[PDB]
Design a protein around this ligand. Structure first.
Ligand SMILES: Nc1ncnc2c1ncn2[C@@H]1O[C@H](COP(=O)(O)OP(=O)(O)NP(=O)(O)O)[C@@H](O)[C@H]1O
Length: 401
């Protein structure tokens, strides 16, 4: 397809760009140069074990045949795992990132989704982690000016999150408890959890992806409004944010609730949504720069001790301010495109950004989630009463009175 191809080209462009970002901000040299160094500095004896980890994941490429599924189940729930089910469908209904999902019926009569991890995923991903740890070591020792601070920790945590299904299961349990019998959100309960098998209540509705492509106006508006609400309700309700959003994680149920099924990227927000954010947006809407700039500097939203352009502040807060200037905002791709257009052309003025490129975690985490959610709202073409949601759920945004 022409479009199929365009999507692939965009993906490759994005990966190229992030590779360049890694070279300029991390590795302190081009990937090819670094690779030549790495191959010289890493023993060839480590090459073939590496390969012999990636072998078996290639073996038995999707979907897994029934026997191997049953083998994984043997390993995780015991050889009499069948006794825990009323029935089990050997033909997978979906794919996961390093596994596949089966529909089944639990022993108590409930329908469940069973996510089964691919047998060779563990050793492959751990060997891959080992290789990247060695490469980080090479950069740290031999690449002058390299910044690899925190990188190994991030790789370890990502790997462990992918390989141990129990972590995601714990996150999901927190949410399932919090949103039990909620009038607008449905979180399936975790039925059982193991490192390589996780079982939860079966829910199905209209996938958000489907609503993005063919949804009615009312479907779009509804699921968009629900996502916006979840985003600000969750840290308020249980001190957690669902995390970076993706349409694959959500669905619209027949009764108008939003089903939420993926909890791998849950982010900690113990104190709830920080008040400085809602406060900043309110003060920016009123263009109260006298109070806005000190508030942002205090919060760490702008760099301290710098000459700041008010025009640039307006530009950086625009995507948050414009939606709450109306009762019901229409999130559109057209509008988002406008939000990417810079107010300050660099031939007019050469300023150094006031933006904080080292955001405090307390701010960085929810802001990243909000960005993902906002982009999804624009794909949905959703009409959302974000002003009212903000007034009720976001600390500091409502008129102080
Ligand atoms: N409770 C459920 N009911 C129905 N389908 C489910 C359920 N839980 C998961 N699925 C399906 O499982 C598949 C993978 O879901 P997901 O939770 O994203 O696993 P994952 O791939 O490990 N996470 P990710 O790496 O971000 O894609 C999707 O096609 C979902 O439709």
């Amino acid at each position: 397809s022409k479009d199929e191809v365009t999507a692939e080209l965009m993906e490759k462009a994005a990966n190229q760009l992030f590779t360049v970002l890694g070279e300029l901000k991390g590795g302190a040299m081009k990937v090819g140069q670094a690779l030549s160094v790495m191959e010289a500095a890493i023993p060839d004896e480590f090459g073939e074990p590496y390969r012999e980890a990636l072998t078996k994941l290639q073996k038995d490429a999707p979907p897994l045949p029934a026997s191997k599924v049953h083998r994984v189940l043997d390993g995780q729930l015991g050889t009499k795992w069948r006794e825990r089910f009323s029935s089990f469908n050997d033909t997978p209904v979906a794919s996961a990132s390093i596994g596949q999902v089966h529909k089944a019926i639990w022993s108590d009569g409930r329908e469940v989704a069973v996510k089964i991890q691919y047998p060779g995923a563990d050793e492959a991903l751990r060997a891959d982690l080992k290789t990247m740890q060695r490469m980080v070591g090479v950069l740290k020792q031999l690449s002058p000016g390299a910044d690899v601070q925190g990188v190994v920790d991030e790789l370890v945590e990502r790997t462990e999150m992918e390989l141990d299904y129990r972590l995601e299961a714990a996150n999901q349990r927190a949410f399932a408890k919090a949103y039990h019998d909620h009038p607008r959100f449905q979180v399936p309960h975790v039925v059982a959890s193991a490192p390589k098998v996780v079982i939860q209540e079966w829910i199905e509705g209209v996938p958000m992806a489907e609503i993005i492509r063919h949804g009615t106006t009312e479907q779009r508006d509804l699921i968009g409004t629900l996502l916006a609400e979840l985003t600000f309700d969750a840290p308020r309700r249980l001190g957690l944010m669902h995390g970076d959003a993706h349409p694959g994680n959500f669905m619209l149920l027949p009764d108008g609730r939003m089903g939420i099924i993926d909890f791998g990227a849950v982010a900690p927000m113990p104190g709830g949504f920080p008040i400085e954010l809602g406060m900043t947006i309110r003060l920016a809407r009123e263009k109260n720069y006298d109070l806005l700039l000190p508030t942002m500097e205090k919060a760490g939203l702008i760099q301290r001790g710098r000459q700041v352009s008010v025009r640039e502040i307006d530009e950086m807060l625009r995507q948050y301010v414009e939606p709450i200037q109306v009762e019901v905002f229409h999130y559109t791709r057209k509008w988002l495109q406008k939000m990417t257009v810079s107010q300050i052309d660099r031939s007019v003025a050469q300023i150094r950004t006031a933006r904080q490129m080292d955001l405090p975690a307390k701010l960085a985490i929810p802001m990243r989630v909000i960005a993902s959610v906002g982009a999804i709202l624009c794909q949905l073409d959703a009409h959302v009463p974000i002003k009212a949601l903000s007034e009720e759920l976001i600390p500091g945004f409502a008129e102080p009175d």
